[PDB]
DNA sequence: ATGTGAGT
DNA sequence: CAAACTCACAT
């Protein structure tokens, strides 16, 4: 499926429009849910009325489906795609920190392009100015090779700080991807657990260190548990400077760390299959904890975890290398 | 204290 | 994966 892709693409495009251009949250979700229930449907849809049988597909989407099936297009959508305001809003919204709200306010004031934004930084917050500054860099893919260099700096700086620190770079990179959008590091320390006294300094000290060595270059945000900023590989002497990259560093309690590393290594299909097989065996898995599931169905109290291996063991699956976590 | 916003 | 959850900024 496959089957009804044209209709689902149609609705995903209507959703985006309602979220990013109207600011009608309920219509956005209405379209998301409709696109989802349709993508699950086993038959090639032939009428709006057939789709209307599906929960979440109502009168109005049935009408649109009818037009789409008849002509292969949707007038509403062709108008949206020709609309400059909509195009501009979607463009601005590609700057990190700029979402639909700021986007409206900016296009309303005639600010629509990168050049335009760079002439109106007084209109932007810190996050958004960082996003404009590295707009091009942040849109480049990161090759595995640089990801690997980056991974070493943080893993090394972290070790030399405190050998008890555990730091892991996750996402598709961890599954062996050839390129990456950004770097998502999960961090923990054995004297930081869920039953303990909350220690921001654990994160802050490694952020500060990565700033000392001039690896972290800008901060988008930094709280007690979550850091989001910008990094840059060092360039030798003069010559060509590396592009600035997005990096997040998240501090997780030690007793929830590996569910974290698992959840955030993906893939989504692999997670879905994993947390669904876990149901079959009688356990619920989220990003934090794996818990058993009683006869009633509702149950809790987390099981002790100290590796990804453990989680696999609980649900009676052989361990799967991150390389093999496609599905 | 609360609400809006943004990103993951 | 949507939803939840962090954090920034305002008032
Ligand atoms: Cl202007
Ligand atoms: Cl501002
Ligand atoms: Cl990579
Ligand atoms: Cl995983
Ligand atoms: Na808007
Ligand atoms: Na709905
Ligand atoms: Na009904
Ligand atoms: Na409609
Ligand atoms: Na963005
Ligand atoms: Na100005
Ligand atoms: Na990543
Ligand atoms: Na943050």
The string of DSSP codes covering A225-279 is SEEEEEE-PPPSSSSPPPPPEEEEEEE--GGGHHHHHHHTT--HHHHHHHHHHHH
Q: Which of the 8 DSSP states describes residue A200?
A: T
Residue pair A253/A244 in contact (Cβ under 8 Å)? The answer is: no
HEC profile of A283-325: EEECCCCEEECCCCCCCCCCCCCCCHHHHHHHCCCCCCCHHHC
CB atoms under 10 Å from CB of A306, counted, come to: 11
Of the candidates A216, A194, A196, A191, the one whose C-alpha atom is nearest the C-alpha of residue A204 is A216
Residue pair A7/A15 in contact (Cβ under 8 Å)? The answer is: no
CA–C1' nearest nucleotide, residue A268: C1
Say which ligand is closest to the CA of A111. Answer: 1
- Return the CATH class of domain A84-140: mainly alpha
Instruction: Calculate ∠ Cα A138-A140-A146, nearest 5°.
Output: 100
Tell me the pairing of strands A183-188 and A142-143.
Answer: unpaired
Q: Regarding the domain delimited by A141-263, which CATH topology (the fold level of the hierarchy) does it fall under? A: Beta Polymerase; domain 2 (3.30.460)
Tell me the pairing of strands A290-292 and A226-231.
Answer: unpaired
CA–C1' nearest nucleotide, residue A98: B6
Residue A64 is a catalytic residue = yes
User: Among all chains, which residue has been given the structure tokens 């860099």?
Assistant: A137
Tell me phi and psi for residue A289, to 5 degrees.
Answer: -155, 150
Instruction: Return positions of chain C under 7 A from a protein CB.
Output: 1-3, 6-10
Residue pair A38/A69 in contact (Cβ under 8 Å)? The answer is: no
The yes-or-no answer to whether A1-83 and A141-263 have a common fold is no
Of the candidates A238, A288, A234, the one whose C-alpha atom is nearest the C-alpha of residue A263 is A288
Elucidated via: X-ray
Q: Which residue is nearest to nucleotide C9 (CA to C1')?
A: A125
CA A201 → C1' B3, Å? 29
Q: Let me know if domain A264-327 sits in CATH 3.30.210.10.
A: yes
Say which ligand is closest to the CA of A24. Answer: 5
Residue ranges covered by each domain of chain A: 1-83, 84-140, 141-263, 264-327
- How far CA A264 is from CA of A49, A167, A171, A204, in Å, comes to 40, 13, 6, 22
Task: Tell me the CATH number for domain A1-83.
Answer: 1.10.150.110
Residues with Cβ within 5 Å of ion ligand 9? A 96
Q: Which residues touch strand C (CB under 7 A)?
A: A 29, 32, 36, 125-127, 221-226, 263, 266, 268-269, 271-272
Residue pair A103/A112 in contact (Cβ under 8 Å)? The answer is: no
Of the candidates A143, A20, A136, the one whose C-alpha atom is nearest the C-alpha of residue A80 is A20
Of the candidates A146, A158, A173, the one whose C-alpha atom is nearest the C-alpha of residue A241 is A146
């Amino acid at each position: 499926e496959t089957l009804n892709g044209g209709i689902t693409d149609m609705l995903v495009e209507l959703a985006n429009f309602e979220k990013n251009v109207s600011q009608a949250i309920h219509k956005y979700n209405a379209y998301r849910k409709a696109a989802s229930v349709i993508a699950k449907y086993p038959h090639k849809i032939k009428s709006g009325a057939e789709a209307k049988k599906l929960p979440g597909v109502g009168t109005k989407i049935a009408e649109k489906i009818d037009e789409f099936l008849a002509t292969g297009k949707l007038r509403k959508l062709e108008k949206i795609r020709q609309d400059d305001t909509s195009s501009s809003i979607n463009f601005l919204t590609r700057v990190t920190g700029i979402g639909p709200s700021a986007a409206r306010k900016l296009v309303d004031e005639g600010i629509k392009t990168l050049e335009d934004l760079r002439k109106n930084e007084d209109k932007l917050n810190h996050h958004q100015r960082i996003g404009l500054k590295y707009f091009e860099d942040f849109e480049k893919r990161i090759p595995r090779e640089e990801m690997l260099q980056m991974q070493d700096i943080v893993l090394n700086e972290v070790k030399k700080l405190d050998p008890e620190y555990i730091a892991t770079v996750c996402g598709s990179f961890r599954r062996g991807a050839e390129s990456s959008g950004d770097m998502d590091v999960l961090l923990t320390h054995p004297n930081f657990t869920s039953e303990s006294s909350k220690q921001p300094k654990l994160l802050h000290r490694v952020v500060e260190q990565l700033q000392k060595v001039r690896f972290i270059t800008d901060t988008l945000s930094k709280g007690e548990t979550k850091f989001m900023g910008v990094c840059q590989l060092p360039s030798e002497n003069d010559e060509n400077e590396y592009p600035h990259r997005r990096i997040d560093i998240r501090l997780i309690p030690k007793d929830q760390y590996y569910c974290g590393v698992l959840y955030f290594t993906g893939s989504d299909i692999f997670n879905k299959n994993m947390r669904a097989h876990a149901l079959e065996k009688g356990f619920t898995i989220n990003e934090y904890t794996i818990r058993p599931l009683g006869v009633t169905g509702v149950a809790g109290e987390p099981l002790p975890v100290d590796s990804e291996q453990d989680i696999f063991d609980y649900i009676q699956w052989r361990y799967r290398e991150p390389k093999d976590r496609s599905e």
